[PDB]
Homo-oligomer: A and B are copies of this chain.
């Protein structure tokens, strides 16, 4: 019968899945690339005043970001796009610990910014000296809400879910009613363990 319109509704969902993952994968990889390039280009030893201006310039007009920060070896925030009320320290963060040990870039899961209270995930790049000692950290915090609006903006009338590897809702876009009786086409992102589920839309009057 109209299994025909269903199968097509399904491949549309698949097409959407790849579009949206590609977008977010792109956003994450691009940010990583920006940070990596900053680390390479800035005169060493890092001058804090210069870093401060660079983060401001980079942060400027990129709703992508919750904030951009720079940390010292101890994990104190020493440069920041958000005016900081008190001293802030992120050495307790999972991504900080991992970044310190691996001396490699780290992407975090969603949490609530100590600095803004908003939900975010971060990209954290260790800055190394000549002897490959980790001395500082670039920290790029992305607003989860930006990703949500990004997806919503393109697929407002499909229901999509983003869930981490443990079932925690990262976010959803669109009306859940659309998912009734639908199995989702789904897949994980590249650099972060978030699973995206796109529900095909129902077969309607035709």
Instruction: Name A's B-contacting residues (CB within 8 A).
Output: 11, 14-15, 18-19, 22, 25-26, 29-30, 33-38, 40-43, 50, 54, 57-58
Question: Is A50 in contact with B43, judged by CB distance below 8 angstroms?
Answer: yes
- Extra contacts besides A33-B37, A37-B37, A40-B54 (20): CB < 8 Å: A11-B11, A14-B15, A18-B18, A18-B19, A25-B26, A26-B26, A30-B30, A30-B33, A33-B33, A33-B34, A34-B36, A34-B37, A35-B37, A37-B38, A37-B58, A38-B40, A38-B41, A40-B41, A41-B42, A43-B43
Q: A11-B11, A19-B18 are in contact. Are A40 and B58 (CB under 8 A)?
A: yes
**Assembly stoichiometry (copies):** 2
Least Cβ distance of A7 to chain B in Å? 9
What's the dominant secondary structure at chain A's contact region? helix
CA distance A192 to B72 in the complex (A): 40
Would you list the 8 A-B pairs with minimal beta carbon distance, nearest first?
Answer: A41-B41, A37-B37, A34-B37, A41-B42, A22-B22, A38-B41, A30-B33, A43-B43
Least Cβ distance of A146 to chain B in Å? 16
Chain B residue, CB-CB nearest to A11: B11
Least Cβ distance of A12 to chain B in Å? 10
Set of chain B residues within 8 Å of A57, measured between Cβ atoms: 40
